[PDB]
Amino acid sequence: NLYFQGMNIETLMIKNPPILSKEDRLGSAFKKINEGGIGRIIVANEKIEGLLTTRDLLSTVESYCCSQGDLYHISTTPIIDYMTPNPVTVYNTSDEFTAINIMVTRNFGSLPVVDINDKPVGIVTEREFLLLYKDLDEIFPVKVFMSTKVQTIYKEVRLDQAVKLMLRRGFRRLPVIDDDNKVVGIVTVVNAIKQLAKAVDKLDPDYFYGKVVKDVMVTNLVTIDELASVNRAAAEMIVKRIGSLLILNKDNTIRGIITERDLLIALHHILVMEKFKEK
Numbered sequence: 001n002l003y004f005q006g007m008n009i010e011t012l013m014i015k016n017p018p019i020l021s022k023e024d025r026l027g028s029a030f031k032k033i034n035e036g037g038i039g040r041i042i043v044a045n046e047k048i049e050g051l052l053t054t055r056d057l058l059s060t061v062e063s064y065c066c067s068q069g070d071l072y073h074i075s076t077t078p079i080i081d082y083m084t085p086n087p088v089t090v091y092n093t094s095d096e097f098t099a100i101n102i103m104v105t106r107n108f109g110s111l112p113v114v115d116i117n118d119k120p121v122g123i124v125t126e127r128e129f130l131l132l133y134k135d136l137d138e139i140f141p142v143k144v145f146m147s148t149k150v151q152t153i154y155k156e157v158r159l160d161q162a163v164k165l166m167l168r169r170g171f172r173r174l175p176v177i178d179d180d181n182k183v184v185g186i187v188t189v190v191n192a193i194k195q196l197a198k199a200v201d202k203l204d205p206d207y208f209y210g211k212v213v214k215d216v217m218v219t220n221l222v223t224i225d226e227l228a229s230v231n232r233a234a235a236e237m238i239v240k241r242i243g244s245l246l247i248l249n250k251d252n253t254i255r256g257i258i259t260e261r262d263l264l265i266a267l268h269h270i271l272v273m274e275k276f277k278e279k
């Protein structure tokens with residue numbers, strides 16, 4: 001029961017997360033965005049001012065289909081123009097359950113952690129709460145928390161179109177299918193931002209607009225049985241360094257997807273329920 005027995009959220013947080021100042025430009029952000037695999041940059045000087053997410057950065061090309069000049073202008077854009085200002089944060093002395101509740105109820109994939117003077121000291125993301133499953137009973141199967149009406153994309157579809165769809169539906173990841181509707185990969189916002197970062201760095205739109213999803217997608221298919229525990233799902237996500245697991249039909253078509261967001265939702269439920277069972 002020791003992961004739940006931490007004095008506070010400092011037990012879980014990533015220290016030294018990527019930070020930039022409000023005076024910095026998006027070019028610098030494109031270089032740092034995937035540092036530590038966080039996928040977000042805290043914007044701060046003395047105090048936290050904003051949070052620049054992967055979505056925030058991918059939105060820079062939302063109204064293009066994009067010149068060398070356009071990419072240069074993105075590169076030189078002040079971070080303040082795209083950051084989420086006044087982000088929700090937790091204090092370093094605060095508890096793990098409150099952080100889970102915030103993320104679950106208000107739909108945040110990360111919380112900056114700040115000290116009493118509002119200075120950033122760390123960050124917690126969905127990934128950091130996966131360790132809490134080590135101390136838990138096996139209560140729920142993957143089937144209960146997986147999503148089943150899975151949005152997929154065909155493997156030859158343009159990456160810019162993949163991005164539009166992800167941003168529109170609010171998914172970080174789309175399983176990729178072939179001619180027989182079999183799953184051949186997963187394209188992710190991390191994939192997409194790697195490519196957009198290259199396009200921005202080189203002022204060359206081809207790195208983003210010239211790619212199809214099969215060119216950049218994750219090709220490791222990590223699957224799980226829908227009757228396996230959410231704890232096993234969590235453990236596997238930690239070991240395989242991924243944020244989703246696929247549930248496949250016998251014919252290798254998609255049945256469902258379970259993500260670290262789903263596992264956070266489930267964890268919230270487990271914790272709330274263990275409050276009741278002690279009654």
Ligand SMILES: Nc1ncnc2c1ncn2[C@@H]1O[C@H](COP(=O)(O)O)[C@@H](O)[C@H]1O
Nearest residue numbers: 147149150151171172173174175259261
């Ligand atoms: N491609 C997808 N199709 C349908 N649901 C998804 C997809 N990707 C993620 N989800 C679900 O959408 C929610 C957000 O997950 P995430 O994309 O990890 O932030 C979770 O309930 C996931 O199960």
